């Protein structure tokens, strides 16, 4: 379906060196649409329950201090195999091994700082979004360009 | 001051023509600190207010009923002249006679579709900023890049 | 109207340097609609008619070798005011006073080398139109973006 | 040899969409040389020879019904390798596979909408050439940037 | 004479701010050739003589601090009308008031962090040039791209 | 460590091409730190040193030959794993082989042409670095941008 959805963050490090525009402009060129879209400081709540995933690791207390020291920019975008579509742009974990042309491979250098997250599954997806936005906050009727889909 | 704001509002033919990165970019890279943003749907009671200074011009109700027919991108940028400076970045009323460079200049056609709006006065920027947000979604502690101000 | 048309071709300077893409992009970004297009080497015949204006003046002559001294693209816009917007994003005669932003305030040194020629009328536009295309080279039925105009 | 040509075609979903200048941009920041280049909306004859291939497949039929749907940007490009070369930047035929960097990979989102299409081989290359192109229209001789080739 | 000369540095703010390479690019495409290049901390004694015009102002001495408090990038660029050029380019003294499109008005907000400078005049050029470059660090022979002049 | 350093010179052919500024543009943007710039013409003593990894090859003569033939633009850039970061940006030796995205995929087509070339290794840059640049010539204390390491 082309109605997939998936979460996108831009971390305080993406926020304070100015990317925020350039990450959306990529994804709105791909063709996906922006479902929703906020900026805000998280609640050291909010990011236990993000990173839930890692809780069992000891780096998981520093991910959560980062995410809460700073302003994140939340979206939600829509579109046919989106999430996968949406990593692939992100590039991989280590920035420094991501190929040119993706968003880490371009912009970052280091693992703890690396700009953006993005959900790695459709569940995850799922689960993601329901803790960033209020339904009330997202795009009830989509409609991307009618000439990207046959 | 160097702590001034302005409005700005992609209107719903800038989101739908998937330039809101590119917009977010422009003022990014201007050296602007994003203190509030927001994709929605206006309401007409919202729509009316923000127009308040058209309401007995005959187009008034064309910029209502437009405004509120689909998502629009609210933000609020931080910095010196920001206001006046948005607006040199915007570009002119008519975006045919908007010079290239500027937004209007180098992406509009149609004043009736000119894509983004600016508040044209700090007073007018008060009043915009207070009647699309909320206090508490707006950044308190801003700072700027350490070499935007002497 | 916006239905009116106007006629820019790339001399081959502006071919020698790899302009065109780069060209078309920011009347394609401004919502102007593509109703013509062909890369061809003018003749001499051509290249006289095109510049009839200027053929009482001693630089006559040398207008016309260097349009066919290689390959031209040319070009056909449609839009709303599209004659004078398109004059204004390529800038003023001489490149050097031209503004940045412009094509030939961006990429242009000398008079007689300034990347494009824009028809300066609509009655130009229409007399240059029918002197490098056929009307079966020019689209019939054209639709811009459905966000472009009011 | 670096008189080798490739046949490419943004087909009418790219023009659509105005990416018509940013593809050309590409090829022509690579190194290569337009030889031809012309937009037309294509007949359902060109249109079946041009996919000649998948006749025998059932997706054969919406292949031949979209090109002719609309405009289509049709370009010969000269250069040592362009025909593995343009393939390369293009991507792969899954856009949504396609790697950022990639022209599918930054702009498309379905197989049945995949912007551009380029020659598979020298062999499919001559023949694409002749079949859209008549050797008139076509640039003879070719004089890529002196600083390209050893 | 397209052997004009102009002097150009990038202040420790436009360093600071990753611009060098994007300034560069500015004057790359515009057709201007690279004829000195060099990055490095100037002492006070080049500070107070690159200075020399403002020394009766109390401005002055925050503008000597400055330049030395961090790596400079300085450059030659030749061609036709370099030096208004490279000013036009630039914008003017308040960044704020600078328009979209020259480097200024892109990614400047204060006066005293305006990015970039460069000569006012040919006079002016010839002094800051031998100020700052050895002949031996300039080439001799230049040769802009054969498409730039008639 | 974060001080890591690689050596970077753009050929001859690379600066013929105007492609200085856009080769530094995209190091910016990663995150490294320029500490040492600039623009030079290599003599046959400077040119055998630097490849003397080739020197039993007969191909050797033609790189010597080639550097030495125009200005060359040097540069040291400092970061985490910028060595084989900066590899992966430039492509691989076959320029039509490289990757769109990254800088020979996206300017080149010839190996004998192929624009850039990047310490290969950690005691391959120690060895350059100390070949180019004179130990005055480079930064001493290098700071990145504070949000670019944990």
Chains 1, 2, 3, 4, 5, 6 share one sequence.
Do not use: C
Not at 80 to 99: E, F, H, W
């Amino acid at each position: 379906v082309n109605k997939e959805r998936t979460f996108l963050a831009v971390a305080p490090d993406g926020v304070a060196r100015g990317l925020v525009g350039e990450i959306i402009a990529r994804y709105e060129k791909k063709g996906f649409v922006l479902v929703g879209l906020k900026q805000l400081v998280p609640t050291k709540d909010l990011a236990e329950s993000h990173y839930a995933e890692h809780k069992e690791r000891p780096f998981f207390g520093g991910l959560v201090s980062f995410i809460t020291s700073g302003p994140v920019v939340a979206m939600v975008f829509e579109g046919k195999g989106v999430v996968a579509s949406a990593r692939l742009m992100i590039g991989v974990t280590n920035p420094l091994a991501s190929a040119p042309g993706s968003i880490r491979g371009d912009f970052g250098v280091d693992v703890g700082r690396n700009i953006i997250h993005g959900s790695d599954s459709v569940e995850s997806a799922n689960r993601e979004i329901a803790l960033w936005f209020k339904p009330e906050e997202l795009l009830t009727e989509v409609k991307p360009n009618p000439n990207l889909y046959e």
